[PDB]
Design an enzyme around this catalytic site. Structure first.
Site, PDB file in Angstrom:
ATOM      1  N   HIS A 278      88.405  47.039 -50.293  1.00  0.00           N
ATOM      2  CA  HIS A 278      88.028  45.593 -50.266  1.00  0.00           C
ATOM      3  C   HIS A 278      86.551  45.535 -50.648  1.00  0.00           C
ATOM      4  O   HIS A 278      86.250  44.625 -51.535  1.00  0.00           O
ATOM      5  CB  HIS A 278      88.327  45.023 -48.851  1.00  0.00           C
ATOM      6  CG  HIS A 278      89.829  45.116 -48.582  1.00  0.00           C
ATOM      7  ND1 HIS A 278      90.394  45.785 -47.525  1.00  0.00           N
ATOM      8  CD2 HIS A 278      90.855  44.533 -49.214  1.00  0.00           C
ATOM      9  CE1 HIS A 278      91.709  45.639 -47.545  1.00  0.00           C
ATOM     10  NE2 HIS A 278      92.001  44.833 -48.554  1.00  0.00           N
TER      11      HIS A 278
ATOM     12  N   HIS B   8      79.561  41.363 -50.107  1.00  0.00           N
ATOM     13  CA  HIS B   8      80.498  40.618 -50.922  1.00  0.00           C
ATOM     14  C   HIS B   8      79.761  40.222 -52.203  1.00  0.00           C
ATOM     15  O   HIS B   8      78.559  39.904 -52.140  1.00  0.00           O
ATOM     16  CB  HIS B   8      80.996  39.339 -50.208  1.00  0.00           C
ATOM     17  CG  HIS B   8      81.622  39.632 -48.891  1.00  0.00           C
ATOM     18  ND1 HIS B   8      82.962  39.794 -48.734  1.00  0.00           N
ATOM     19  CD2 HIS B   8      81.067  39.848 -47.677  1.00  0.00           C
ATOM     20  CE1 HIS B   8      83.222  40.089 -47.475  1.00  0.00           C
ATOM     21  NE2 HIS B   8      82.110  40.131 -46.812  1.00  0.00           N
TER      22      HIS B   8
ATOM     23  N   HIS C 129      78.205  45.759 -44.923  1.00  0.00           N
ATOM     24  CA  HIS C 129      78.905  45.704 -46.180  1.00  0.00           C
ATOM     25  C   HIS C 129      78.479  44.488 -46.923  1.00  0.00           C
ATOM     26  O   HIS C 129      77.782  43.623 -46.399  1.00  0.00           O
ATOM     27  CB  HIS C 129      80.405  45.642 -45.980  1.00  0.00           C
ATOM     28  CG  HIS C 129      80.863  44.468 -45.222  1.00  0.00           C
ATOM     29  ND1 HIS C 129      80.946  44.352 -43.875  1.00  0.00           N
ATOM     30  CD2 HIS C 129      81.216  43.279 -45.698  1.00  0.00           C
ATOM     31  CE1 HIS C 129      81.301  43.105 -43.535  1.00  0.00           C
ATOM     32  NE2 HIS C 129      81.440  42.446 -44.669  1.00  0.00           N
TER      33      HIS C 129
ATOM     34  N   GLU D   7      79.529  34.388 -49.746  1.00  0.00           N
ATOM     35  CA  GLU D   7      80.571  33.748 -48.918  1.00  0.00           C
ATOM     36  C   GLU D   7      80.022  32.423 -48.356  1.00  0.00           C
ATOM     37  O   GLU D   7      80.540  31.350 -48.655  1.00  0.00           O
ATOM     38  CB  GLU D   7      81.036  34.721 -47.835  1.00  0.00           C
ATOM     39  CG  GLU D   7      81.773  35.908 -48.437  1.00  0.00           C
ATOM     40  CD  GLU D   7      82.704  36.595 -47.522  1.00  0.00           C
ATOM     41  OE1 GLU D   7      82.287  36.877 -46.385  1.00  0.00           O
ATOM     42  OE2 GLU D   7      83.840  36.859 -47.944  1.00  0.00           O
TER      43      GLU D   7
ATOM     44  N   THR E 103      85.284  37.194 -41.915  1.00  0.00           N
ATOM     45  CA  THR E 103      85.633  36.600 -43.195  1.00  0.00           C
ATOM     46  C   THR E 103      86.710  37.333 -43.966  1.00  0.00           C
ATOM     47  O   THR E 103      87.087  36.939 -45.066  1.00  0.00           O
ATOM     48  CB  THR E 103      84.420  36.402 -44.098  1.00  0.00           C
ATOM     49  OG1 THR E 103      83.949  37.678 -44.518  1.00  0.00           O
ATOM     50  CG2 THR E 103      83.344  35.541 -43.482  1.00  0.00           C
ATOM     51  N   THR E 104      87.228  38.418 -43.371  1.00  0.00           N
ATOM     52  CA  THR E 104      88.379  39.132 -43.854  1.00  0.00           C
ATOM     53  C   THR E 104      89.380  39.191 -42.738  1.00  0.00           C
ATOM     54  O   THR E 104      89.077  39.117 -41.570  1.00  0.00           O
ATOM     55  CB  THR E 104      88.037  40.565 -44.305  1.00  0.00           C
ATOM     56  OG1 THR E 104      87.471  41.246 -43.186  1.00  0.00           O
ATOM     57  CG2 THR E 104      87.149  40.618 -45.449  1.00  0.00           C
TER      58      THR E 104
ATOM     59  N   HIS F 169      76.367  41.587 -44.996  1.00  0.00           N
ATOM     60  CA  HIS F 169      76.738  41.351 -43.622  1.00  0.00           C
ATOM     61  C   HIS F 169      76.424  42.581 -42.798  1.00  0.00           C
ATOM     62  O   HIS F 169      76.986  43.653 -43.045  1.00  0.00           O
ATOM     63  CB  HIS F 169      78.252  41.061 -43.515  1.00  0.00           C
ATOM     64  CG  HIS F 169      78.627  39.760 -44.060  1.00  0.00           C
ATOM     65  ND1 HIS F 169      79.933  39.373 -44.343  1.00  0.00           N
ATOM     66  CD2 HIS F 169      77.821  38.727 -44.430  1.00  0.00           C
ATOM     67  CE1 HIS F 169      79.899  38.185 -44.843  1.00  0.00           C
ATOM     68  NE2 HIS F 169      78.673  37.763 -44.933  1.00  0.00           N
TER      69      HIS F 169
END
Length: 257
Positions: A61, A93, A91, A103, A195-196, A116
């Site tokens: 991901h 995004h 991690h 995000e 958020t996942t 994040h």
């Protein structure tokens, strides 16, 4: 299983994770005009001097930089928080292009990426227990814009070739997350979620106002990662962001005037 495509992406997640349509989902758009300054909010305390990074992981991901969370080594406190939150991982995004990737959004503006830093509330003993609590996690979110290189990021960028595909990890010791922070710790805060998947509603979000700068070359290296496993058809790891969700019955508060 879930991902970011047309057939498994964010609009599909609610079928396996019905909280996706919950009352406190993340990310959200931060409307700067309506976020109110809260003079009762404290400065954030970020204490990362003894952080002990161990490993970097491609989980299919994103990639996760993991920490030793077996002691109070790297903790977030203050700000909107009660008690002490231990760093477990960070991690990012990011987008296919510099015009998207974050995000959270700020007045509908999308940044090129978002970092994040995930921390769990020590009063619940472990991460898995923490995510079952409404105040279990504190996530520090930091926007990335493309401009000057971030020297503290380059060690991460360096290693990504060794973790191209899903399930690959590499030793990643002695990495100092302080080199990923902006100058100011001014922030917005609100109650939300992971958020996942599993999208659990356990997070106090702390989103810094000031973005970091990274270079185009740095971001381009993130976009060479793969969502697929070794020897499977190549699908570039890009656009691994969930769009903004409805604010519902929430207030976003600002630490600054």
């Amino acid at each position: 299983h879930w991902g970011y495509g047309k057939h498994n992406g964010p609009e599909h997640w609610h079928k396996d994770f019905p909280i996706a349509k919950g009352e406190r989902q993340s990310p959200v758009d931060i409307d700067t005009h309506t976020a109110k300054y809260d003079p009762s909010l404290k400065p954030l305390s970020v204490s990362y001097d003894q952080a002990t990074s161990l490993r970097i992981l491609n989980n299919g991901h994103a990639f996760n930089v993991e920490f030793d969370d077996s002691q109070d080594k790297a903790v977030l406190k203050g700000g909107p928080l009660d008690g002490t939150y231990r760093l477990i991982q960070f991690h990012f995004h990011w987008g296919s292009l510099d015009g998207q990737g974050s995000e959270h959004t700020v007045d509908k503006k999308k940044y090129a990426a978002e970092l994040h830093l995930v921390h769990w509330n020590t009063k619940y003993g472990d991460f898995g227990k923490a995510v079952q609590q409404p105040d279990g996690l504190a996530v520090l979110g930091i926007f990335l814009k493309v401009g000057s290189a971030k020297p503290g990021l380059q060690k991460v960028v360096d290693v990504l070739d060794s973790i191209k595909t899903k399930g690959k990890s590499a030793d990643f010791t002695n990495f100092d997350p302080r080199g990923l922070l902006p100058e100011s710790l001014d922030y917005w805060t609100y109650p939300g979620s992971l958020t996942t998947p599993p999208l659990l509603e356990c997070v106090t979000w702390i989103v810094l106002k000031e973005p970091i700068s990274v270079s185009s070359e740095q971001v381009l290296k993130f976009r060479k990662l793969n969502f697929n496993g070794e020897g499977e058809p190549e699908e570039l790891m890009v656009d691994n962001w969930r769009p903004a969700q409805p604010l519902k019955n929430r207030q976003i508060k600002a630490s600054f005037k």
